[PDB]
Amino acid sequence: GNLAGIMHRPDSEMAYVVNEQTVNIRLRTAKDDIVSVELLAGDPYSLRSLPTDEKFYQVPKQMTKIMSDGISDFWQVTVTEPKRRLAYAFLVTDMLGIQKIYSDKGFFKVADADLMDMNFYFRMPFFQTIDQYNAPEWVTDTVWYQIFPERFANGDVSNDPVGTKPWDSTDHPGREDFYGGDLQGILDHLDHLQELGISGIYLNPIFQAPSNHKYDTQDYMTVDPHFGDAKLFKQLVQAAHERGIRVMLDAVFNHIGDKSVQWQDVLKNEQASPYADWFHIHQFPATYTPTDNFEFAADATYDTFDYTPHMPKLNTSNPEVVDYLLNIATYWVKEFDIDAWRLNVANEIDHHFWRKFHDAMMALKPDFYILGEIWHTSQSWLVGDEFTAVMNYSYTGAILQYFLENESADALVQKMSHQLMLYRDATNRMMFNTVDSHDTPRLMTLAHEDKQLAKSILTFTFMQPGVPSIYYGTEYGMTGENDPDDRKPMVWQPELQDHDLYDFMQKLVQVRRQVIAKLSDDKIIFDVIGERQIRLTREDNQTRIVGVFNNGTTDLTVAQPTSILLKTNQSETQLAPNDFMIWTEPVR
Amino acid sequence: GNLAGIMHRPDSEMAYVVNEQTVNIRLRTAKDDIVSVELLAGDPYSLRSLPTDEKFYQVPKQMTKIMSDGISDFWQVTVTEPKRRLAYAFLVTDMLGIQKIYSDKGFFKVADADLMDMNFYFRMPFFQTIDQYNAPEWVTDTVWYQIFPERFANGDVSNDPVGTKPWDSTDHPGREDFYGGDLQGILDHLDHLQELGISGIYLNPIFQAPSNHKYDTQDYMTVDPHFGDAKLFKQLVQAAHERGIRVMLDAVFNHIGDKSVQWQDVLKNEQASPYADWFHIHQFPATYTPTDNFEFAADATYDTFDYTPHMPKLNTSNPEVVDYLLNIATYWVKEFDIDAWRLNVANEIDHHFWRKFHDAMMALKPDFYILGEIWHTSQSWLVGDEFTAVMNYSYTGAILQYFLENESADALVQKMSHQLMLYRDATNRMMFNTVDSHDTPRLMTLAHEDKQLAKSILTFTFMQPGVPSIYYGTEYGMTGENDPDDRKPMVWQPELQDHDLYDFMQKLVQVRRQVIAKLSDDKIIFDVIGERQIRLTREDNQTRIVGVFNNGTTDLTVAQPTSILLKTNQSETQLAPNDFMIWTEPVR
Ligand SMILES: [Ca+2]
Ligand SMILES: [Ca+2]
């Protein structure tokens, strides 16, 4: 067998606590090299301490091959142990029938293994629920809607910035434009959100800042006055909550804006500033050489987000900064009852801070949702002591690549499988899936205005384990290239809205919330049934939901389903190129 | 190539911060399958943000194959980056010359890789020294001596337990025997320790407890009165410190003894006890059925260490228990200036507690040494936020197995290589290497009283990266089977001491402290030079120390070294079976 392809990392996503007496264990092997895996497991102390002749290694537990990423196969088993201590090893058999035991001590013939020595085995030493990953259940039933507040709705012309342009969803906005969107506009259109069926709003930053996007924070403790005030934000959160809609705000803690009191004090007082060590300043005075691009300097004497001199990086290892940021994070939860924080550039802040943040939030709200913005693999933030989830850009990016280009269905299924096996099962269900955002081109533009393709992408994404999000205006087919063009004023004129797409998105949201969210502990299965043809199944003990996606260039015929939930062709059996069909069937 | 055998786990022992601008990166591949590995790495934002034509991926960095465990090869490189943000990927070429790029997105031909997208790469997002592993430098120069205080020296008959037996190192002690050893006895023999050359004392538990081993704690805040009192312990620590000897105490925090105030309160008051939730009680009253073995019950209604009813497990997730234990840990450091804590059964206490413990200790003493007793792989406790090191029983156990049985030298070198590549390089230098202890048979008994074999085992262990420890009496050749027989009264009668072994151990301690500890940033190399013949090299930029060990059944001839440090044969060129020779040479 391919022994170099076999690996088990103890105390990780491959061995973790699910409840006081139960653990999940995984093994990686080389694809199709290993025929079978059994787990030998039990209480380490039982081997020598108990007077019985029975030994735990005499009754193996079968492991199941659950996924493959094209390189490796992944196997899993759930183990229950009342003594809440576990020693375990793997019996692996390859395609030629060669069997070995694999343990913390390496690879052995069974006859050579020291099975009576507890230290031979991998260990889960005591099942610690304080250390385990917990998923908040309310997120399961959520469909999110992301609002970039400058561009959603102007409900109050009297707070508009100087130079505000007329509201025109056909504009191509520049980087410094204002259209006057604000919190009253969101309040004004809560009926639209409830009619669409969404149950969570994600706001981009709303705190005082000079820009239209407000990531260059001036004051974290004040709603930007062009958006509203504290009273209005409280009214908005209560009105959302009354409609069953949770609220997630954007925490911009990696850097502060250069018009903040703190940075302005550094510019006035240099190293004598009380805030000098709140930042990462290499040489005083803190300076840079301006260029023709506001957002770029080649030589700032302080660390920044990217290379923009207007966003000095915060020193989150400084205990005064930790206290400042934790007080901000507490204030908005305690005084306004928000339900979640989305963490901007969360990977560039240290784990020590995020553990303190996690502890503070869970002490306020044990079901709080902490969402990190990270575009690469995120295992070390998703153990259960830092974030709940991340924005799942690697996963939706792979979906986009499949639908928009011409890779094989095998390639896509390999990539999604790889992703899921990076994380604990409950973590995968908390991941935040959005196909586009204020940082990407719009879906309808990526699809070259092919609405059928856009519907397929959205439906495929809405069938995945993670929770889906709709970027404002997707439901009417808004177009746009990348930032700033993906931030057009929301389309409120009916002549300019795609009503068919809105109707479709209402139906899709209903399949997600009424069917997919209501299965119990389901299994997801990816089947490649032909060239660019995929069958996705989610199933529990009672019911199976199946979606077939034909993204080749030929017609596909399927058996007429008894209960079709959603389809694009008028036929109940034939799928043309880029059609899909979702149905439900009982499990037999 | 064997792609299933290639793996890089970001933010782990394969990618970690060594200082503000420097990181160490590792890759695993299948043994001898990959010919070369280059790293492509640089600031993620530099790709699109900088106006230059240069891109970081145009100048690869060569990685070096540093170890092999017989299954996998391990490659390493050190990278410096002034922007303190790193994106990286690996260029791997197999034995047939097939080259691929391996990144967070998987495996690609170079021509197909999206090298301009920062999200293609693995990431070290910002170099966080607050999250990094730190090794205390004083441990580098230490050789430890482990004292089981009941059995080292009786310096005060007036505190002896009732039934104390006459001091006789030829006795076979029973599990409940007392010989009257105490803290005054240790004070009385500090000259012996200084003459041997040791610079750290590890004491087994000294707090009030009814047994001879005192792991069944009655009161953590009081020195056991058969050992001494607070004044005497302060005198002992100051006297040790005056001689350049650090002091490590045993923290028994996984369980408490059943004669403690807390457990006795549970027995009196059942669930109405203020301490009921300090424990893991499944059913009240807390009870068990006694057996003929004091240390075993089959049905205790509360969790215990092993199956002994006298050691109820502490609930370290309870904040009252956390506070109690942290106060104890603080008290002995603050009031008595101890230098380290050894943590008994440390794996069965939760990571949340150990992070709080770590933070508390480092705030008192930034160079504190935290040593966990764990007999299996310990990666998740050695990241830099919990322990400094563990008792390195997997490593010394492999050494013992080689010298005492007849496996190949390749097998041993594979096992040691596997061990070292589990951990960060600095961690490996902090590991605590003892060949025997109060929990194992004695070295001289394992060696069947073959003193030459015992000398080889000790010398081989003392050349390893971790810090060595001598269990009391090893230096005079004490014998003993496992506990309780490994706890004989210390041999103080000269007629019964092996003076040749004591002389040898003085010389060996001097090679460790004067030569091996004084190299700068050295490399360790394991060479198998013949059947059961091993050449161990440690070398820095100026000097190389080489040890050759002949453990076959034939003579071995080596070149006459110019500067021999330590050898067992009278010859300067010939090694008989089980001889060794250590020398030093300049690096050319
Ligand atoms: Ca307005
Ligand atoms: Ca005494």
Tab-separated table of N, CA and C in Angstrom, chain A residues 49 69 112 183 231 352:
chain	number	residue	atom	x	y	z
A	49	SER	N	-6.082	-2.515	33.488
A	49	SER	CA	-6.703	-2.300	34.796
A	49	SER	C	-7.900	-3.201	35.048
A	69	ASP	N	-10.839	13.544	-2.658
A	69	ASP	CA	-10.490	14.774	-3.381
A	69	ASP	C	-9.646	14.526	-4.628
A	112	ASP	N	2.876	-8.003	15.427
A	112	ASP	CA	3.965	-7.256	16.053
A	112	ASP	C	3.509	-6.049	16.873
A	183	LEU	N	-29.464	54.314	6.810
A	183	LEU	CA	-30.191	53.328	7.610
A	183	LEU	C	-31.699	53.475	7.456
A	231	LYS	N	-30.235	56.108	17.874
A	231	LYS	CA	-31.666	55.836	18.004
A	231	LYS	C	-32.200	55.109	16.777
A	352	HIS	N	-4.314	35.129	19.717
A	352	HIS	CA	-4.515	35.512	21.120
A	352	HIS	C	-5.687	36.494	21.271
